[model samples]
Target chain A: QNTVNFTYPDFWSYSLKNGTEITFLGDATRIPGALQLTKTDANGNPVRSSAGQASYSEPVFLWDSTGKAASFYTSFTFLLKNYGAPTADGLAFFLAPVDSSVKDYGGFLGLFRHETAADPSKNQVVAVEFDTWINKDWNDPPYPHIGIDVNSIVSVATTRWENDDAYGSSIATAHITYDARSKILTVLLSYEHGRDYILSHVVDLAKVLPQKVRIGFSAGVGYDEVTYILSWHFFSTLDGTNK
Target chain B: QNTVNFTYPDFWSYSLKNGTEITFLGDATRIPGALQLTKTDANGNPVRSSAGQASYSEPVFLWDSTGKAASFYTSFTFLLKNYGAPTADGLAFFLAPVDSSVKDYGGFLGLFRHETAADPSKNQVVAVEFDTWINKDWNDPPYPHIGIDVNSIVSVATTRWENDDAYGSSIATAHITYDARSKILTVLLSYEHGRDYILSHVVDLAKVLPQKVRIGFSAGVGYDEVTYILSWHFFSTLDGTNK
Candidate 1:
């Protein structure tokens, strides 16, 4: 009944980059696959890079030769633990061409290079961002929020992240469903045992992305702040039709 | 870019049955292909069966030989003109095995024959019924309603159809999207010029129906009443892969 259902802990087909560390956090019964964007050494110090970023693209590309982005639904659970008083940036879930380059840092969330973030045509991507920090220069909302980005840093629609329980629990779940025919994208968010908030936007995925694209999560952090992805369940209805 | 976009009057690849009549109405400026369960002669006299029932199955099957009911999205606009006092029955959107038998009348909606309606072992079908008439003897709701059925006459879920504009205008549009991975089915209804109401349910298509099924529409009319299907557009991500 399930075309493709992949869980993070059991999957090893992700392409990592920019000092990202992926590790198993617990034993078989207690394990929840986790990924970290900022790496720390045995002495609990940043080892790889400052202002680090990571892009984990699924090994395979979602293909649709019919010349349109196929409809898909994906769900994942994540935790954005705070590093210090000044939370740096945030993370993003993106759908972009398999060959998409990883660049940009901080609020860019590994989706765009800071130098080219202003030119949308240079970036073929559709992303949902879970932003924890507000950069006034970028005109981000003052509070933590979720936004939909189409080829640019600016979001088309945004909803404030208002779940106190979610921020306190440091864990949250997200369910995203896209309908290609209607060009509708819907997202649902919930804390460990909190209320569910739903949001939707109308978008033409084919207009912003290529026929084949990679789906994955990306996160970036500044000097002291960091983020971690605790578990993910990504499923897609896209199959080998246009190959 | 559309996987399958069927605009009635423009496409002609459906199998008609049991006194059904398919015709294109209006000119280029305004047109919507129309399907009727009852046929009349030039003199406006009944030319086919009275209390007729009809089924129209798309020519091709939705086959994903990998043994899964491939995910799909379908949308259509329809008009149900009141025949007379005491509107007899209503119409249905159905997915059935390519070889499914079409029988029964009235509220059966050409989906089942009275002899086999109760035997889930015999009929392999999934249907969404837009029922106008209540068969009190059969425990049907007194008011118009929408119901989902799997192989049998009984429905898994029911919702009252309480749109005044929909009932008055007799013209309505519907959008249905199914995600095979999550087994989630979403339905949207709107009047010719009214608001859209959305509802979603979780059900496994593969568990309830055959792997390869045909998508179509069916309707039935009791004595002195009738129904019509204005247009339909069916599309799916299912492709040429059985492996």
Candidate 2:
């Protein structure tokens, strides 16, 4: 409320070598990860020519506000999908403030495949991955959902359709809320195909979203894969009233 | 047709080293430019992946009735268009006697690129090319039709999509017939998409078809590449009804 250093970068934040860069003050050294630089894909993928527009987050805030003075709430929303067998990878949100050397290509690369050796010793990297690959680790039959990853190894939590056989597709609005007051983090993943609107799943932020964390998103292709994001928005809910 | 010494190679006729393995008989010694092999993305631009497949033909025969009274017909049939993108480079049907030298891989390499060459003397080979790229001169607008080539550089006669937008994608079927009675060679290139119906364009084959040619099809992808044939059929239309 006092130091409104909150500034939006350019429109979207990804290109060869130009975008608003930021530095977070979350006791970065004391905390495992603390720097948060937001990014989104617009023109195309970093490597291939087919990657369509993928704006993960708008130019929200390039702020240096720390701690109690930084007690601000921001929510992110987006619409996207994965297509083509050799498809484009999906996007992700990150809160790791340790390293700035993010992978260039989309897929898991742009999303930060953080290894401790490349990051600080105590870094805690959380990725709410919009994974499309079907494997034993993340299987939902026809409907694949969101997953919360702690430090990139432990699958702290995930969501799945009760009826596996039903083919549920989506392009829905999602929300991730961080309440510094209650130290509670919440993420709601939903989708809409037609009149059959569905809130695919929801999760508790504490289980994954930690306060005073680095912030960003990622994307990339798997063995032979690719996915895309359409848009992303960040909302400020100060008194739990205004979005 | 007296005692004919029908002799060609086996199935490995187009490999790097000959006399042992044979794949197809269409060689490119008579063509110009270069025998290029390529792979690429779906947009036809150069890409790196193992997503294409092709094969040439080899010389095989159904020796006459009693090794003496040989008066029947020789026939073979495979499938094509299996992988659509029925890649460029080229393809051919061989119909020669049994020999032992030809190999696979590039059986019809030199002959496919023979047009518009500084040196047309390499016109020793004969072929019906489903030419797409304009190497030597057979460049059709992203369509599938056929051409009759003798020594690569000169097309005795060619017939492809008269209209650029008419050629509906890839090759559906192809065949060449040598009518011993009339000494006339009839070549047919058929393509189809919806409803499993085939439409063919025929070319009068004068010199190539009747000359103890190897019997098979050859295909390769070029710069705007990544192509393959699903199934191939090679056989003599002896019954008079090969529609």
Candidate 3:
């Protein structure tokens, strides 16, 4: 078994600025892995009469560790701010196959139109959706949420962590970890609200990503909502073990 | 002694959809009386800014009880859904004789800046700044608050409250009373966070308003916050009779 460690570059480091999204595909010839959002009317419902607001986006960072051993670890850390709107659309992290032209930006993958896609099942990858917007088709259960889904289609596991814990002028941190051996994915949610780092909830990532995949980022605003991502980091195994 | 009962149509109202500047005296010819907000910004900021992206609003229902022997009482009831980022920027009921040109939306009055214009000390007006935005300028010690600021702009009686305890997808009500006898005014803040009316605080409103003045509504928002008001009504007494 071999390992390789990569320190995130300044461009790939944490962020708190206005609009930033980064994506990296192992192979450009393969699928580009889709990340999209939708347009919600004032009632927070997806309206067919209207199109989604432009997809707010940040660049993607590529981390290629192909042909590597199966037993490895990978992680991502990012800070999110919703200053644009006390209520925003929200941001997301993704692990999909290298395939492009699969889902558009404002609907389907962009819109989270789960049942509709180029390949709804195995051909697509998984997504960890961190949402601030609620629509008729979202998580189904109530409240804002963070959930795991296969190929942006179906949910495996989701934690209603922050639920609606939106603290103005505050910062929140999200850590996503993958244990390749046990094939378990875990997410730890927490935020700073007046000198406290409150832990929200932990979720099982395996519920979605049952297999290997590439990873990236995507964010946007729809209808009357807008969101901002401070920064995101892709971490290889600290022991130089790449997952 | 004469007892007068003013009906609802006696007041003028406005609903804000697009962005516009609403000055107190600019619209009316006869020293425009107090104004009422039929609709507000998403977060309830009376003077909601374009930069603030959420949808919530604080509506104002104001009137003039100057010169006559009048007392004041008002109750507001509304349904609020903690959709995106919901906040009780602490709704206030104010009585100030100042002109309406006071405009700073973000910091100064939030929506309540008119208090600065109509000095309360001259016996020309009285006010109750139901401040929601926590500021060292008005609040004491440290924490979210419910206080009565005197004509001196200092909080006479302060009560700090919690966010979760104050809001959610529910109905809320605040009852404010004024007694012209002892020149005493008191406010009872309550909201239905669960099943019943949650009595949060009772403060002396007289310290905030001691004399006859025009009354209305105001609210404010900060870096990453939004506040709201559901419904408002003002009850008053003339010639010492509670109407």
TM per candidate comes to 0.46, 0.31, 0.33
lDDT of 3 at B239: 25
Name the runs in model 2 displaced over 4 angstroms: A1-17, A21-79, A84-89, A104-122, A135-143, A161-170, A193-214, A223-229, A236-243, B1-243
- State the lDDT of candidate 3 residue by residue for A80-106, as single tens digits: 434343344555556654343224333
> By lDDT, is 1 or 3 better?
1
Model 1, global lDDT? 0.58
Name model 3 segments beyond 4 Å from true. A1-4, A7-88, A105-123, A163-169, A194-213, A238-243, B1-243
Question: Candidate 2 at A218: error in angstroms?
Answer: 0.8
Residue lDDT tens for model 2, A47-155: 3412221222223322232433122322233434333332334445655433333553333435334343234234355566655444443222234445555555333
Give the per-residue lDDT of model 1 (tens digit) for A114-207: 7777678887888888886688877787677888888888887676666363245367777676655546676656554344444457777867
Query: Candidates' DockQ values?
Result: 0.02, 0.00, 0.01
| Worst 10 contiguous positions by lDDT, candidate 3 chain A | A26-35
lDDT of each: 0.58, 0.34, 0.38
Off by over 4 Å in 1: A1-4, A9-32, A41-69, A84-86, A163-169, A238-243, B1-243
What ranking of all candidate models by TM-score puts the best one first? 1, 3, 2
For candidate 2, the TM-score is 0.31
Judge candidate 3 against the unseen true structure and give its global Cα lDDT, from 0 to 1: 0.38
